[PDB]
Amino acid sequence: ETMSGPLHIGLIPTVGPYLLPHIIPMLHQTFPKLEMYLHEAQTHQLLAQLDSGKLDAVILALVKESEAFIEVPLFDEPMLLAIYEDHPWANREAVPMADLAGEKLLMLEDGHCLRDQAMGFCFEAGADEDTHFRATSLETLRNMVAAGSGITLLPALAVPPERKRDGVVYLPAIKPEPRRTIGLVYRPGSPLRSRYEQLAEAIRARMDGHFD
Fold first, then answer.
1. Which residues in the chain are classed under CATH 3.40.190.10?
2. CATH numeric code, 1-77+182-212
3. In this chain, where does the modification S-glutathionyl cysteine occur?
4. Which terminus in the chain has less CB density within 10 A, N or C?
């Protein structure tokens, strides 16, 4: 019927790996006849393939470039601080954002920054934001933090159950708590919009209160 057949879904690298395990089993139960194909690529590549018609829908961090499409907010995901064990802040319980000034921040060119990068910076204006690992990935960042190359912010879904793991300590960032909005995007005027909407609603429901 309405939720049958293939659906090609795109997810950005900083969302896909960590969100899928939470929603795939639920989608298999809610739509037994739906066949999902998952694709991961950077925001620009996903929005181009969505416009081309190669993808049905895309899940990403809503940014300025996704306003030309239909955006359905799914949930707000906070970001936590990741620092190596032997870092001075290791014994703190929370760290205000203003403190990131004069600290070496690792970051990614896509799906990571809190600010649109027309402002000149990614997380904090006075921070020393490294560019050498900008074209890599989230797991690369996590492992370089453990190696002591610097610190960074990671989406909550990418943080292990423990406060400390493999030489990395994860702690809350406050005043204000950094957050990003993950949403489902699709072509406006799309003939199969009813299907995309039902899909977005099922995900919003499952993730509701996940970070409370």
1. 1-77+182-212, 78-181
2. 3.40.190.10
3. 113
4. C
